[PDB]
Write an enzyme that holds these catalytic residues in place. Structure first.
Site, short mmCIF file in Angstrom:
data_model
loop_
_atom_site.label_atom_id
_atom_site.label_comp_id
_atom_site.label_asym_id
_atom_site.label_seq_id
_atom_site.Cartn_x
_atom_site.Cartn_y
_atom_site.Cartn_z
N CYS A 12 -68.32 68.59 78.31
CA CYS A 12 -68.95 69.43 79.31
C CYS A 12 -67.98 69.68 80.46
O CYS A 12 -67.75 70.82 80.84
CB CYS A 12 -70.26 68.79 79.85
N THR A 54 -76.83 60.78 82.69
CA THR A 54 -77.00 61.17 81.31
C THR A 54 -77.67 60.06 80.51
O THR A 54 -77.84 58.94 81.01
CB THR A 54 -75.64 61.50 80.63
N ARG A 82 -70.87 59.26 89.01
CA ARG A 82 -72.19 59.59 88.48
C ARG A 82 -73.13 59.44 89.67
O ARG A 82 -73.11 58.41 90.33
CB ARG A 82 -72.59 58.62 87.36
N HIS A 128 -70.97 64.08 88.75
CA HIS A 128 -71.78 64.35 87.56
C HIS A 128 -73.21 63.80 87.60
O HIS A 128 -73.45 62.72 88.13
CB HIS A 128 -71.05 63.77 86.34
N1 LIG Z 1 -75.62 65.05 77.80
C1 LIG Z 1 -74.75 66.01 78.21
O1 LIG Z 1 -75.01 66.69 79.23
C2 LIG Z 1 -73.47 66.30 77.48
C3 LIG Z 1 -72.48 67.39 77.84
C4 LIG Z 1 -71.29 67.42 76.93
C5 LIG Z 1 -71.08 66.63 75.88
N2 LIG Z 1 -72.02 65.61 75.51
C6 LIG Z 1 -71.76 64.73 74.32
O2 LIG Z 1 -72.59 65.17 73.27
C7 LIG Z 1 -73.14 64.06 72.50
C8 LIG Z 1 -74.64 64.30 72.70
O3 LIG Z 1 -75.12 63.42 73.72
P1 LIG Z 1 -76.68 63.58 74.21
O4 LIG Z 1 -76.70 63.69 75.74
O5 LIG Z 1 -77.52 64.64 73.53
O6 LIG Z 1 -77.33 62.10 73.84
P2 LIG Z 1 -78.84 61.80 73.40
O7 LIG Z 1 -79.05 60.31 73.21
O8 LIG Z 1 -79.78 62.56 74.36
O9 LIG Z 1 -78.93 62.51 71.93
C9 LIG Z 1 -78.32 61.86 70.76
C10 LIG Z 1 -79.29 61.88 69.56
O10 LIG Z 1 -78.57 61.26 68.46
C11 LIG Z 1 -79.54 60.67 67.63
N3 LIG Z 1 -78.80 59.83 66.65
C12 LIG Z 1 -78.33 58.54 66.81
N4 LIG Z 1 -77.69 58.06 65.70
C13 LIG Z 1 -77.77 59.11 64.78
C14 LIG Z 1 -77.29 59.22 63.45
N5 LIG Z 1 -76.63 58.29 62.77
N6 LIG Z 1 -77.53 60.41 62.78
C15 LIG Z 1 -78.22 61.40 63.46
N7 LIG Z 1 -78.71 61.40 64.70
C16 LIG Z 1 -78.45 60.20 65.32
C17 LIG Z 1 -80.37 59.92 68.67
O11 LIG Z 1 -81.64 59.40 68.15
C18 LIG Z 1 -80.57 61.01 69.73
O12 LIG Z 1 -81.74 61.84 69.54
C19 LIG Z 1 -72.49 62.84 73.14
O13 LIG Z 1 -71.24 62.62 72.45
C20 LIG Z 1 -72.19 63.31 74.55
O14 LIG Z 1 -71.14 62.51 75.13
C21 LIG Z 1 -73.20 65.47 76.28
#
Ligand SMILES: NC(=O)c1ccc[n+]([C@@H]2O[C@H](COP(=O)([O-])OP(=O)(O)OC[C@H]3O[C@@H](n4cnc5c(N)ncnc54)[C@H](O)[C@@H]3O)[C@@H](O)[C@H]2O)c1
Ligand SMILES: NC(=O)c1ccc[n+]([C@@H]2O[C@H](COP(=O)([O-])OP(=O)(O)OC[C@H]3O[C@@H](n4cnc5c(N)ncnc54)[C@H](O)[C@@H]3O)[C@@H](O)[C@H]2O)c1
Ligand SMILES: NC(=O)c1ccc[n+]([C@@H]2O[C@H](COP(=O)([O-])OP(=O)(O)OC[C@H]3O[C@@H](n4cnc5c(N)ncnc54)[C@H](O)[C@@H]3O)[C@@H](O)[C@H]2O)c1
Ligand SMILES: NC(=O)c1ccc[n+]([C@@H]2O[C@H](COP(=O)([O-])OP(=O)(O)OC[C@H]3O[C@@H](n4cnc5c(N)ncnc54)[C@H](O)[C@@H]3O)[C@@H](O)[C@H]2O)c1
Lengths: 333, 333, 333, 333
Positions: free
Chosen positions: B150, B180, B232, B177
């Site tokens: 992000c 999260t 954060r 930030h």
């Molecule tokens: N949150 C943000 O604003 C943001 C911005 C940029 C990048 N990211 C990156 O994107 C990724 C997404 O993070 P997020 O905020 O949605 O976290 P989150 O916990 O909200 O969503 C992750 C999902 O993954 C699922 N999951 C766990 N193990 C799994 C598996 N083996 N197979 C399938 N699904 C599985 C979880 O149950 C959960 O619903 C992370 O790497 C994060 O660092 C997040």
């Protein structure tokens, strides 16, 4: 032991009072606040959301505020020149209303019988001081002075050490600051700048600050080589300074760490702190330091360009400095 | 129109899905999340605290998630290589679990029948891309790619414009930030770094980020000239980047404003935004831009040393970029 | 002085430990937490966002956690039955992981050499106790017991006094509770109930609680005459109970005030508190009472229908009760 | 189409204006606020932290506020009687400053040429009304009226349905309310009640409210059978009402659900809502209902004693009711 009067029983007025009764460096004998009567003063001084209940006794007795057995004369004047500081025996007056920061307006206290006035905020014309940076430059000919701002007391100490050792060519700073009495709970009429009126609980609010530029006043060599801005975030207290600067003499991060640590164990002990612990903002709650270098949070791009991080309890640190400053002035009488 | 599969129905997985159904640039045909069953998926997709209720229809029908009438195949596999992407007809797979970011781990999806995989996070070895900065460098020989972070999608666009026009000698950035899913509601066990386990609601938490250094990957010329860190703070969404850099060619702040604005009205339209309005963080809620230059919040010390400010909805902006990226890849098939 | 072992170094595990070392009522000799190693335990115990830095010494020495000079044996077992409580000399074990609340699961500790187990949460089958309400009903034949919930320890004491004096015909309660480790920073997958997964910082979240119904277990006469629910609001600690009940015998509000105050100065001293001060939630930070009647906040419709308000630091109060309970059990050995 | 003037461009003044331009039920022709000038009015109306950017056009043109092409006359009077409502052609005036709630003070607007005045808050003497509960009782002989309070508009609708169907013997209510402009960001001088001056971001604050008692005015049969209080918690918007009452006629919870649902699909459609969804506070952001019954959150002890839960966006709901009310009055001219 110098007798002190406090004008404006707000966050700073109350905390300066609290700090005074703790170190016993000065003696608060009078307080003035037209918007807070004796009984209310007892409640507001006793209970504190961010710093906890007062350790001691607070009471209304014979129309006086009695803290730890010491009776304090209470005034309700809206006009500074009307306050009878002399009758109450107040020699120094802490101007902490945020409404009388000019040398002329803050001087009104002198008409009441006060001998000296310390503005608990930056001033447009009054001489500004920062403990551990330029307090030695204070002398008896000064009746009205300023203790700068919370942010300046954080930056100056750190800048001094960094400049004295490597020389600051130029620097820009950002301060992630906790909300203050100035802000609003929800979008409303700001006093002054438009963004400051936006909900303090919902937003990160950009704000301007003259803190970085003020360091040029307490440390003349840095005059014009610094400037910055601020971000107000939704936390009740404790702030952090992010200083990005170009060094004249090369310096590995570890040399900066060595230098700052020595400064915290020596002359700046109690003013500038140093830590390598995995700290977060609340770990500085009620911390009396003006600034604490965070070794692990900073980062260097190279030997001339680095980002230094320092924490500060904007309420407690500043308050103690106001007392420390008065204690210093008194020793010069 | 390329058919897409989403692995991990989290903030990003759900928002990428939401963005896909809105622009109709791609078609989500399958979703996999072992910790969320169909009925729960309906609830979590329909209601959203930060972005509001979904404008459309969401239902469980015949064991499938039906969004706006489009049936989606649901998988409950914990192991990526087991997911039957091929049977569901998913050509591209969005890896958004945050647990399979290496080229090898994310490749497991290929065994299921997927043709390409897009990691919705930075990757240690997979090629990273940023819309409007280096997406043109993508080609069909790449099966596994990354859309960066992000924060990188916020910094890169701005850095590009600034570098192309004045040249960035060196720069250090800080990002305030929003919290999260990674953080904790109260002091608890940290997954990775010690400070990150401290109460997210009570503290400003220093954190390291490779975002600034990652810009050196999408913009090779800046490689090694940038680095930074993060803080954060207690807000649910929307973040801001503070870039402090030394310019090669002199440039008045107004020239920087002129240049960034032109970039936002031209090539980077929809990616890099520009504003002179008195904005605050919530004014960027659900804003699809990857980065928005804030003219009034920035400040310059001189013609070579300046601090630039850019806002970004870390959830919505990034999500749309993931879709935009897939739309781009598809046009190259 | 009974030697204690703590299973689960979380908010309660750490605070029970902190409370134990303060009152010296019991002696913590061993702690087990597979997700926190010795060095991390030092950091988490020393620094606390909501209750401040620990006032003592905490160190890692010879593979042991040394608090105020007392060495503590550290275990890293995931399976309770594997923990060697006997070798460490732990007689009582505090089950505070929130994962072994059944008489059978919590009994695993007995295999390790423990003599008794106290579940720091409600239990489906283990006998529940509340200091000042029914602890006297504890006897040596009980190996596995429960100290109820934070909310039950608040309601029970108040209900007892009110019932003993006027008789509670029926009552419904609501508790505005601070967030806990169970909640999420942003909308995410919830432990068990769907609403509990919604962002803890952005919402007021309705939640069910068996607390009111549990009072029927510690005070049999009230069995079936009480029930209620909860609201999770965005504060880090301290909660309040709102009890609405019909009285059997008429009682002016001032009679209720008189009765509760006497109870707080007598038998329930230290358990049930009483105040007429203009208090707010933070005024109860680190307050060790299980429940504090707020005279000024309650309100009566008539002599038989009234709303009673009581505050409680859900972390500190409960923790001290766990220690008080163990101290009581020990005196019965 | 009745022409309206708004006195006080605050949260309610701005949101009533926003609601008016959306439904086009009434036409805002003039606004008065001595603490906000035209340019500031544009900014504050355009950007809104809790309800998002205004969907439309807002501009300063020829000294007038132009919303969606409609020019609005701007006044800067501090004294109501001085405002020239007649020249601006404002027939109805919305008194939303919170400083002129008495029939006499709010009447000042009549001297300016206004024909009717609607106080957007409870009034000590002016007749209070609640859409869907007693608006039918309004007639042309009334020049000065009140639309009650946000909380009363939530409770009344629900109480009506419950009373009409089972009869309310007695009831006590509690409202967990979001913070408002009245509160302070940090401990400071409260305007009025001492607890209300404590930091809004750090505490749960008990507060009194005449809302429950006011229901006795719009629903005479309930007069004297209801009362309650409030708790201010740290959220920017959206509140919830918890009604605990004794029923005259027995009623299973499911009968109450059946009855409330029918009322929401019939006469109270748009006023009283009904849901069985796993909702949380933010799911009601910008929701125009005055009250929404939450089936899953309520609980019954028995067939005569139950706790009913209802949500309400204290800003948006109330605002639309002010418009709806004026639309109703106009149809009676
Ligand atoms: N949150 C943000 O604003 C943001 C911005 C940029 C990048 N990211 C990156 O994107 C990724 C997404 O993070 P997020 O905020 O949605 O976290 P989150 O916990 O909200 O969503 C992750 C999902 O993954 C699922 N999951 C766990 N193990 C799994 C598996 N083996 N197979 C399938 N699904 C599985 C979880 O149950 C959960 O619903 C992370 O790497 C994060 O660092 C997040
Ligand atoms: N808030 C901080 O963290 C912080 C840190 C350093 C410096 N300062 C500076 O110190 C000053 C104190 O700010 P604060 O947080 O205590 O604000 P505050 O609003 O809490 O305190 C101001 C006090 O002034 C009183 N007052 C108002 N008008 C008065 C008058 N005419 N005469 C006498 N008393 C009057 C008010 O009743 C109030 O108690 C400000 O100028 C601020 O810039 C504040
Ligand atoms: N949080 C409160 O205010 C409060 C008040 C009263 C009662 N309780 C109850 O006390 C328990 C403590 O909850 P908490 O808030 O401290 O949560 P927490 O998450 O802060 O602490 C739980 C601890 O359990 C540890 N743990 C997890 N699995 C384990 C395992 N298999 N073996 C050993 N340790 C393990 C975790 O590392 C963590 O440190 C819960 O059952 C809760 O219902 C909590
Ligand atoms: N805040 C809510 O959600 C809500 C819901 C229902 C009812 N209400 C009631 O409605 C009223 C509106 O409250 P609000 O939240 O908008 O508060 P606010 O402070 O946001 O709005 C009040 C406005 O009054 C203006 N004002 C002050 N003195 C004036 C004068 N002499 N002449 C003209 N304008 C003047 C201020 O500049 C401000 O914009 C209050 O009485 C409140 O109790 C509020």
């Amino acid at each position: 032991k110098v007798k002190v009067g406090v004008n404006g029983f707000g966050r700073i007025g109350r905390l300066v009072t609290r700090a005074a009764f703790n170190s016993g460096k000065v003696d608060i004998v009078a307080i003035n606040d037209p918007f807070i009567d004796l009984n209310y003063m007892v409640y507001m001084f006793q209970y504190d959301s961010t710093h906890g209940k007062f350790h001691g006794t607070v009471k209304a007795e014979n129309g006086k505020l009695v803290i730890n057995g010491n009776p304090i004369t209470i005034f309700q004047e809206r006009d500074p020149s009307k306050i009878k500081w002399g009758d109450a025996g107040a020699e120094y007056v802490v101007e902490s209303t945020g409404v009388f920061t000019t040398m002329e307006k803050a001087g009104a206290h002198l008409q009441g019988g006060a001998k000296r006035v310390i503005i608990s905020a930056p001033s447009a014309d009054a001489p500004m001081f920062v403990m551990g940076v330029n307090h030695e430059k204070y002398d008896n000919s000064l009746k009205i002075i300023s203790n700068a701002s919370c942010t300046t007391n954080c930056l100056a100490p750190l800048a001094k050490v960094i400049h004295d050792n490597f020389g600051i060519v130029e620097g820009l700073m950002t301060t992630v600051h906790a909300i203050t009495a100035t802000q609003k709970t929800v979008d409303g009429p700001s006093g002054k700048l438009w963004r400051d009126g936006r909900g303090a609980l919902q937003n990160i609010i950009p704000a301007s600050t003259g803190a970085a530029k003020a360091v040029g006043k307490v440390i003349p060599e840095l005059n014009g080589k610094l400037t910055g801005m601020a971000f107000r975030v939704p936390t009740a207290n404790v702030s952090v300074v992010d200083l990005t600067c170009r060094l004249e003499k090369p310096a590995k991060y570890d040399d900066i760490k060595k230098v700052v640590k020595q400064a915290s164990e020596g002359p700046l002990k109690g003013i500038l702190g140093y830590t390598e612990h995995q700290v977060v903002s609340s770990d500085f709650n009620s911390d009396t330091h003006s600034s604490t270098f965070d070794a692990g949070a900073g980062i260097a791009l190279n030997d001339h360009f680095v980002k230094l991080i320092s924490w500060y309890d904007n309420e407690f640190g500043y308050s103690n400095r106001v007392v420390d400053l008065m204690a210093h002035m008194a020793s010069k009488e």
